[PDB]
Design a protein around this motif. Structure first.
Motif, PDB file in Angstrom:
ATOM      1  N   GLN A  66       2.049   7.236   7.988  1.00 20.06           N
ATOM      2  CA  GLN A  66       2.684   7.336   6.681  1.00 20.06           C
ATOM      3  C   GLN A  66       2.676   6.019   5.921  1.00 20.06           C
ATOM      4  OE1 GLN A  66       6.636   9.083   7.676  1.00 20.06           O
ATOM      5  NE2 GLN A  66       5.886  10.899   6.586  1.00 20.06           N
ATOM      6  N   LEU A  67       2.952   6.113   4.621  1.00 21.05           N
ATOM      7  CA  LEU A  67       3.104   4.913   3.799  1.00 21.05           C
ATOM      8  C   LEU A  67       4.572   4.731   3.456  1.00 21.05           C
ATOM      9  CD1 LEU A  67      -0.058   5.499   1.620  1.00 21.05           C
ATOM     10  CD2 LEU A  67       0.250   3.611   3.236  1.00 21.05           C
ATOM     11  N   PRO A  68       5.010   3.534   3.095  1.00 25.33           N
ATOM     12  CA  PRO A  68       4.171   2.368   2.872  1.00 25.33           C
ATOM     13  C   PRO A  68       3.735   1.596   4.119  1.00 25.33           C
ATOM     14  CG  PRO A  68       6.467   1.789   2.518  1.00 25.33           C
ATOM     15  CD  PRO A  68       6.446   3.246   2.860  1.00 25.33           C
ATOM     16  N   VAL A 102       0.815  -1.204   0.000  1.00 24.62           N
ATOM     17  CA  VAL A 102       0.000   0.000   0.000  1.00 24.62           C
ATOM     18  C   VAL A 102       0.853   1.260   0.000  1.00 24.62           C
ATOM     19  CG1 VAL A 102      -1.844   1.243   1.144  1.00 24.62           C
ATOM     20  CG2 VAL A 102      -1.680  -1.274   1.347  1.00 24.62           C
ATOM     21  N   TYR A 103       0.752   2.039  -1.076  1.00 18.98           N
ATOM     22  CA  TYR A 103       1.638   3.195  -1.226  1.00 18.98           C
ATOM     23  C   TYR A 103       1.155   4.125  -2.322  1.00 18.98           C
ATOM     24  CZ  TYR A 103       6.299   5.447  -1.488  1.00 18.98           C
ATOM     25  OH  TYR A 103       7.348   6.339  -1.500  1.00 18.98           O
ATOM     26  N   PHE A 104       1.740   5.312  -2.421  1.00 20.20           N
ATOM     27  CA  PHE A 104       1.340   6.252  -3.465  1.00 20.20           C
ATOM     28  C   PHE A 104       1.866   5.794  -4.816  1.00 20.20           C
ATOM     29  CE2 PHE A 104       2.472   8.310   0.569  1.00 20.20           C
ATOM     30  CZ  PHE A 104       1.244   8.790   0.988  1.00 20.20           C
ATOM     31  N   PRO A 105       1.268   6.284  -5.895  1.00 22.77           N
ATOM     32  CA  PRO A 105       1.686   5.849  -7.237  1.00 22.77           C
ATOM     33  C   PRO A 105       3.049   6.405  -7.625  1.00 22.77           C
ATOM     34  CG  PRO A 105       0.134   7.648  -7.390  1.00 22.77           C
ATOM     35  CD  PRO A 105       0.161   7.255  -5.935  1.00 22.77           C
ATOM     36  N   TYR A 131       4.600  -1.384   8.865  1.00 27.26           N
ATOM     37  CA  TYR A 131       4.954  -0.078   8.347  1.00 27.26           C
ATOM     38  C   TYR A 131       6.484   0.046   8.421  1.00 27.26           C
ATOM     39  CZ  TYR A 131       0.013   0.552   9.235  1.00 27.26           C
ATOM     40  OH  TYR A 131      -1.353   0.414   9.255  1.00 27.26           O
ATOM     41  N   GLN A 132       7.044   1.031   7.747  1.00 24.58           N
ATOM     42  CA  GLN A 132       8.469   1.318   7.659  1.00 24.58           C
ATOM     43  C   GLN A 132       9.129   0.478   6.562  1.00 24.58           C
ATOM     44  OE1 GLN A 132      10.145   3.660   8.867  1.00 24.58           O
ATOM     45  NE2 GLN A 132       9.132   4.388  10.734  1.00 24.58           N
ATOM     46  N   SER A 133       9.566   1.171   5.514  1.00 29.34           N
ATOM     47  CA  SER A 133      10.108   0.521   4.324  1.00 29.34           C
ATOM     48  C   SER A 133      11.298  -0.342   4.699  1.00 29.34           C
ATOM     49  CB  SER A 133      10.498   1.564   3.273  1.00 29.34           C
ATOM     50  OG  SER A 133      11.402   2.512   3.821  1.00 29.34           O
TER      51      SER A 133
HETATM   52  N1  LIG Z   1      10.458   5.959   7.941  1.00 32.29           N
HETATM   53  C1  LIG Z   1       9.380   5.733   6.938  1.00 32.29           C
HETATM   54  C2  LIG Z   1       9.119   6.989   6.100  1.00 32.29           C
HETATM   55  C3  LIG Z   1       7.847   6.840   5.276  1.00 32.29           C
HETATM   56  C4  LIG Z   1       7.495   8.098   4.513  1.00 32.29           C
HETATM   57  O1  LIG Z   1       8.283   9.044   4.463  1.00 32.29           O
HETATM   58  N2  LIG Z   1       6.314   8.065   3.916  1.00 32.29           N
HETATM   59  C5  LIG Z   1       5.768   9.143   3.110  1.00 32.29           C
HETATM   60  C6  LIG Z   1       5.833   8.768   1.625  1.00 32.29           C
HETATM   61  S1  LIG Z   1       7.280   7.798   1.118  1.00 32.29           S
HETATM   62  C7  LIG Z   1       8.266   8.905   0.058  1.00 32.29           C
HETATM   63  C8  LIG Z   1       7.759  10.329  -0.086  1.00 32.29           C
HETATM   64  C9  LIG Z   1       8.374  11.374   0.658  1.00 32.29           C
HETATM   65  C10 LIG Z   1       7.907  12.689   0.545  1.00 32.29           C
HETATM   66  C11 LIG Z   1       6.848  12.987  -0.305  1.00 32.29           C
HETATM   67  C12 LIG Z   1       6.392  14.299  -0.411  1.00 32.29           C
HETATM   68  C13 LIG Z   1       5.349  14.611  -1.281  1.00 32.29           C
HETATM   69  C14 LIG Z   1       4.744  13.605  -2.036  1.00 32.29           C
HETATM   70  C15 LIG Z   1       3.692  13.918  -2.892  1.00 32.29           C
HETATM   71  C16 LIG Z   1       3.071  12.911  -3.631  1.00 32.29           C
HETATM   72  C17 LIG Z   1       3.521  11.592  -3.530  1.00 32.29           C
HETATM   73  C18 LIG Z   1       4.567  11.274  -2.671  1.00 32.29           C
HETATM   74  C19 LIG Z   1       5.001   9.956  -2.549  1.00 32.29           C
HETATM   75  C20 LIG Z   1       6.068   9.648  -1.705  1.00 32.29           C
HETATM   76  C21 LIG Z   1       6.691  10.646  -0.946  1.00 32.29           C
HETATM   77  C22 LIG Z   1       6.245  11.971  -1.061  1.00 32.29           C
HETATM   78  C23 LIG Z   1       5.184  12.281  -1.915  1.00 32.29           C
HETATM   79  C24 LIG Z   1       9.567  11.109   1.556  1.00 32.29           C
HETATM   80  O2  LIG Z   1       9.486  11.757   2.607  1.00 32.29           O
HETATM   81  C25 LIG Z   1       9.880   9.918   1.709  1.00 32.29           C
HETATM   82  O3  LIG Z   1      10.839   9.694   2.444  1.00 32.29           O
HETATM   83  C26 LIG Z   1       9.724   8.962   0.537  1.00 32.29           C
HETATM   84  O4  LIG Z   1      10.647   9.114  -0.531  1.00 32.29           O
HETATM   85  C27 LIG Z   1       4.337   9.453   3.536  1.00 32.29           C
HETATM   86  O5  LIG Z   1       3.557   8.566   3.897  1.00 32.29           O
HETATM   87  N3  LIG Z   1       3.978  10.735   3.511  1.00 32.29           N
HETATM   88  C28 LIG Z   1       2.628  11.187   3.836  1.00 32.29           C
HETATM   89  C29 LIG Z   1       2.498  11.784   5.226  1.00 32.29           C
HETATM   90  O6  LIG Z   1       3.521  11.885   5.937  1.00 32.29           O
HETATM   91  O7  LIG Z   1       1.388  12.159   5.613  1.00 32.29           O
HETATM   92  C30 LIG Z   1       9.698   4.570   6.000  1.00 32.29           C
HETATM   93  O8  LIG Z   1      10.901   4.258   5.876  1.00 32.29           O
HETATM   94  O9  LIG Z   1       8.791   3.977   5.411  1.00 32.29           O
END
Ligand SMILES: N[C@@H](CCC(=O)N[C@@H](CS[C@H]1c2c(cc3ccc4cccc5ccc2c3c45)C(=O)C(=O)[C@@H]1O)C(=O)NCC(=O)O)C(=O)O
Ligand SMILES: N[C@@H](CCC(=O)N[C@@H](CS[C@H]1c2c(cc3ccc4cccc5ccc2c3c45)C(=O)C(=O)[C@@H]1O)C(=O)NCC(=O)O)C(=O)O
Lengths: 209, 210
Positions: free
Chosen positions: A51-53, A6-9, A63-65
């Motif tokens: 947060q995701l994933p 489960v994660y963003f596209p 949770y936590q990649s």
């Molecule tokens: N320690 C944890 C960290 C998990 C984490 O950071 N998740 C992020 C998305 S992952 C990803 C990520 C980050 C920032 C952003 C910022 C904007 C953004 C906009 C549209 C789509 C995504 C998709 C992913 C994503 C991000 C976006 C980056 O910070 C990340 O480190 C990653 O590269 C998340 O859920 N954000 C929503 C929110 O907090 O409410 C792990 O290892 O899993």
């Protein structure tokens, strides 16, 4: 499919564990979360660290990649041959995470003003991983030992996304360069990386790379 | 000599939790202290894999990365869960602990004055997942995961101890977390270690901030 992701596209923090499942011939479900859906509040409030994933393995939800990479490493036998190798595996993945953290900080909070500076510092940041390969069988196998580990897929991703950010950044690192080619040529991983579900996903969520 | 050596600056910082682990587990270790002077020279730094401390030695095995050392000790001293399922929840806790420790060291070293009010405001939201984690396991009367201590416990505990220094009473909103800290702190060897000058006379951070 035994697994659910489960994660963003985007690729982001799911690229490495994706590379891993495909490479290990595993099957899984992609639960794609849209910004809209995320802006809702329902799912997020329900996430342990908000947060995701998120990942499901049977009745097991994590949770936590990095927790998911270690869990797959642990259950699929991708975590070193012994306690000594596991520790080195961990040392690599921790170093990989440290550079990843500097990567996302550039991408999302300071791309335009710190990119040059970031790139000036890159080789010094990549040098430790070629050094690691240099001490393991002349860098002809994997990052740790002669068996693949979860940290391989994580470092692979990190290298791939940096090639995009700073093409030729690997040119000065022969072992790193060859490791990328070798790992990318493993068949299943090869086909995955050539697949639209990888190729047609952006690396980050804000269009920068 | 002890089979364990800790190479670090004269601070608690990223070595606090693993020292607590070792103390509490009755393990022997040597401390190798590194001054700024020494660090400023560059020979040590040059030789560190990622150019940083801590540096850890278990016999001829040399480790870098504080969480790598925790997991290594967790692995060897059986503080990594009862089963593979537990091992992952343990990891999931530690990743959350590291995530918050990362925000903390950023405040301490790069934005203390300007950022402290906003940090303390967001703190309860950062602490809640752990309260939730305790409330889901024996009503928080045992450990963060399962019914046996793990490396995540020591790391979490340290995380909570330093946040009590930065935000006194912050755990007044989390009864389970409060009881937890009192419980773990009361383990005979840990309590003993925690009141000792070897722990007390070290500052938490290197810039005089807490
Ligand atoms: N320690 C944890 C960290 C998990 C984490 O950071 N998740 C992020 C998305 S992952 C990803 C990520 C980050 C920032 C952003 C910022 C904007 C953004 C906009 C549209 C789509 C995504 C998709 C992913 C994503 C991000 C976006 C980056 O910070 C990340 O480190 C990653 O590269 C998340 O859920 N954000 C929503 C929110 O907090 O409410 C792990 O290892 O899993
Ligand atoms: N991912 C690694 C991180 C290791 C790491 O960050 N090490 C730092 C000191 S640790 C520690 C730490 C940081 C910053 C500073 C900054 C100034 C400082 C001055 C005098 C003593 C210390 C002692 C510790 C310390 C720091 C100092 C903070 O950044 C940290 O996060 C920690 O809290 C270091 O070696 N700096 C030398 C340099 O790079 O050249 C891990 O988990 O092990």
């Amino acid at each position: 499919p035994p697994y659910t992701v489960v994660y963003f596209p985007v690729r982001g923090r799911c690229a490495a564990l994706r590379m891993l499942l495909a490479d290990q011939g595993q099957s899984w479900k992609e639960e794609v979360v849209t910004v809209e859906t995320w802006q809702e509040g329902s799912l997020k409030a329900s996430c342990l660290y908000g947060q995701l994933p998120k990942f499901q393995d049977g009745d097991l939800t994590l949770y936590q990649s990095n927790t998911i990479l270690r869990h797959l490493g642990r259950t699929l036998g991708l975590y070193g041959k012994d306690q000594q190798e596991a520790a080195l595996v961990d040392m690599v993945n921790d170093g990989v995470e440290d550079l990843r953290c500097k990567y996302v900080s550039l991408i999302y909070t300071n791309y335009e003003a710190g990119k040059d500076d970031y790139v000036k510092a890159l080789p010094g940041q990549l040098k430790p991983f070629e050094t690691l390969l240099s001490q393991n069988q002349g860098g002809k196998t994997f990052i740790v030992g002669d068996q693949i580990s979860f940290a391989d897929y994580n470092l692979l991703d990190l290298l791939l996304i940096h090639e995009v950010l700073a093409p030729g950044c690997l040119d000065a690192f022969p072992l790193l360069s060859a490791y990328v080619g070798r790992l990318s040529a493993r068949p299943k991983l090869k086909a995955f990386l050539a697949s639209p579900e990888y190729v047609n996903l952006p690396i980050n969520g804000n269009g920068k790379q």
